[PDB]
């Protein structure tokens, strides 16, 4: 039951920092890469961030490049999405997912966490 539970999501004003903590259990956390995917209310899914297995590599979507940072602690088997300077379009149900492919060109998300609602209040 490779299970990913996140927490740490709530309402916020624009221009304030919020940190998302996604825990992991039931599998070798260090052996697998991890992603973050957000789904805006009434809209489809959108990928935002990548972290490598070790944490040595990370890429971000061009809309939110540099405005977020992503990190993992291999000791506590916990995934982190440290977000700064939130805007109005950032409201979504953020999902922590796990990379599921072993070949270079292609990858997919077999397990998914339940989700944290990040709401921005104008």
């Amino acid at each position: 039951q490779v299970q990913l539970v996140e927490s740490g999501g709530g309402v916020v004003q624009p221009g304030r920092s919020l940190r998302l903590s996604c825990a992991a259990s039931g599998f070798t956390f260090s052996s697998y890469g991890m992603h973050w995917v957000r789904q805006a209310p009434g809209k489809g899914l959108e990928w935002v961030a990548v972290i490598s297995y070790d944490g040595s590599n990370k890429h971000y979507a061009d809309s939110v490049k540099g405005r977020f940072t992503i990190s993992r602690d291999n000791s506590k088997n916990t995934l982190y999405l440290q977000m700064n300077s939130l805007r109005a379009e950032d409201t979504a149900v953020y999902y922590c997912a796990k990379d599921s492919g072993y070949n270079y060109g292609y990858s997919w998300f077999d397990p998914w966490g339940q989700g944290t609602l990040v709401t921005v209040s104008s």
Binding site: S31, Y32, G33, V50, S52, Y53, N57, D99, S100, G101, Y102, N103, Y104, S107
Partner: peptide, 13 residues
């Protein structure tokens, strides 16, 4: 690099 840097396989990747 035929395998993936984001996800390293246990083996055979």
């Amino acid at each position: 690099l035929h395998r993936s840097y984001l996800t390293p396989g246990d083996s055979s990747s």
